[PDB]
Design a protein around this ligand. Sequence first.
Ligand SMILES: Nc1ccn([C@@H]2O[C@H](COP(=O)(O)O)[C@@H](O)[C@H]2O)c(=O)n1
Ligand SMILES: Nc1ccn([C@@H]2O[C@H](COP(=O)(O)O)[C@@H](O)[C@H]2O)c(=O)n1
Lengths: 390, 390
Amino acid sequence: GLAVFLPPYPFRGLKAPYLWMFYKYLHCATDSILFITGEDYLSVTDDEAQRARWEFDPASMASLGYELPNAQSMACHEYLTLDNAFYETLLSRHHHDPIKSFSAFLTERIPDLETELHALLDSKKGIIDQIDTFISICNCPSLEHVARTLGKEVMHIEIGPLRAPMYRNTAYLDFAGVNGGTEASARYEKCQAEFDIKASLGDLHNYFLEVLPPAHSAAGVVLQVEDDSNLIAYNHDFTNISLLSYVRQRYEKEDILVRAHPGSLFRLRDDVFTIDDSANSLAFINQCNEVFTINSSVGLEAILTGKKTTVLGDCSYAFINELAGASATVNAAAFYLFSYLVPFDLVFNQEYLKFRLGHPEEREIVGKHIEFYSADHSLSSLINEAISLE
Amino acid sequence: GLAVFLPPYPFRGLKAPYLWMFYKYLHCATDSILFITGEDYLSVTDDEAQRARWEFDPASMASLGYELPNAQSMACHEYLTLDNAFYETLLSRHHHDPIKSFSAFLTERIPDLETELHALLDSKKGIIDQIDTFISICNCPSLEHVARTLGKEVMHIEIGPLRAPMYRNTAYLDFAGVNGGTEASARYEKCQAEFDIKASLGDLHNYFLEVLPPAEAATHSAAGVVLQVEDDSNLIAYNHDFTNISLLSYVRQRYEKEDILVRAHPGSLFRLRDDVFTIDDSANSLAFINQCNEVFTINSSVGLEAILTGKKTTVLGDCSYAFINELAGASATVNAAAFYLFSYLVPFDLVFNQEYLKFRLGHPEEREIVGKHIEFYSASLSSLINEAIS
Ligand SMILES: Nc1ccn([C@@H]2O[C@H](COP(=O)(O)O)[C@@H](O)[C@H]2O)c(=O)n1
Ligand SMILES: Nc1ccn([C@@H]2O[C@H](COP(=O)(O)O)[C@@H](O)[C@H]2O)c(=O)n1
């Protein structure tokens, strides 16, 4: 079975931070799952003070394709719960800075965590050999170290850069890391000769677009959520304010359009920059000549719509932007969209997960994904035909 | 099949640094092996400007239990060879410091290396699917990153802390790391209840000794200092910044020179002048330890030896046996040392035995591992060890 790692540590001040993934795996479950998580994930539904959480919003449920679990759904699965005394102790060892503690969690081994993980997995004999793979929503060298000792793989799985309602829902699935330390460029370089796609970047974009496009600054600045893992561990020290300064070296304010992340706690004053108030990020980038980002999903959007895009942080799609030719870029973007990204529902499907655990060929992977997208032959022929059929 | 990684990079100034492991795997091969190495490893045996190397010394060959390979032995296997152009670039990227370059190789991902490893593995079709596991003589996050992407384990394998002629030959086998980042303590914490050993510390030592221990020494020094090879990976990456000279300084903070007995590593390029420290000239490290009341080390194999003789031991670097030293009780120390010697350590010949390697690759219970080892040494878990100690 699956072992799904969903840590309770409230690095960003929220209990059960990964609750949506917990609910999605429960809803799409076909077999018993081992959940390595916290007690908060189980008691959140009866906590009256948390009922305004977006995970309980029917619009969010419908968008991500899950419904709330009942006692019956819960009982089908096994649970190991992590203790909070470690989180306090973790904070203690990082000057009580929860963000730097989060950074350590993402990028460093933590012996105490490894110990507790080993003890939990051993708490019931048989558990370890039932495990076919670990799943984690984030990079975690503590878990990954434990996994090597036990001979288990770690799939890193997260909602992707293209999301409903603007796009078909996508997801990341990466054996090495998600967002940071990804294997997308390595996978592409191995199979790049198989990609000869007769389309433009905009044609690729259109395939994933689910809506009629919205239909004039030189510089567009994409801002992100300030305490996102992307801006904590994978940012190359860049922040929203230093990204702005970067762009301000290169442009006068009259040529700068800034869009804050809707999910941010902060937003711009309207005295100094021209502030974007578009209804979506696509309408925002469409007004810009070139786009600047650290490692936002919107960076990929900019690339697919043909805009010159600057990416200052580490991210899974950055290698697409580093290629010189237009044809080379299209082929890389096609691999990324059709083989690296996964149809969202599939990374919660145990049959698909077992398929990927076998480490099949890129051709098979693309075949599976297009089969899903076309729910309604060479690799390049598959993609070209899919694009043509629309 | 096995994939054995033996890098050609001459960090310490010597071509084909891991030549002995190459020859040993060739000798004990029972199936075709994939060697990821350098062409320096292939040309040395008939390069007669290289005759004076220790790997060709009949004493070394007998001691490690191998013979030189002939042309027919070589032809049984597959070879992928790494380019030197990367090494030069690696050096220029680390201020032309070969030692700090070695450190990065040991502790950091190197994108260029990963690209080449992926290209070599992908060079000829069929190779990756026939790999059961990678084997590396050292930590290498570049290789380990590649292995995650391909879904393969990495066994870290090296000669152990107990070696002939003084002891039975032992080896390390560790899925997480060798010397640094080891999984010894994690494995022990998981199974420590199974180790209730009713034998003395001396009984354990005696089991591994091939010779009788030295008689009670006339005259004892208060403090013994173990020096190591200055550019050993243990003093480069796993030393916690300690060096031979800072270790000496450490002890001098606690002892007058007249109470200090220092033993240089026989393999070192350097040795102490004759007039400031009392210099050891014992026939072996065991006779040296015997003259000391307590022993100080960074992370030498001799540290384990001091522990096995019941001497108070200070360990300043990271190493696999350190967790033994951190216990308070003598009986608890015995139990842990028993796990270490019989389950963590492997009989030397077996780590070159493909059947044994496939056994470990199945991640069997500790009881099974101990049984396999004792079976070799003899030519409940505790009762099996208790009886062996005899
Ligand atoms: N400046 C921004 C950043 C993100 N977003 C929205 O948030 C989604 C996720 O973006 P991030 O990867 O930056 O968090 C985008 O696909 C987009 O819909 C936005 O609308 N404006
Ligand atoms: N100061 C030292 C260090 C090592 N040695 C020898 O070298 C072997 C390997 O030790 P290292 O781990 O320090 O390299 C020891 O088992 C011992 O035989 C020694 O004789 N004197």
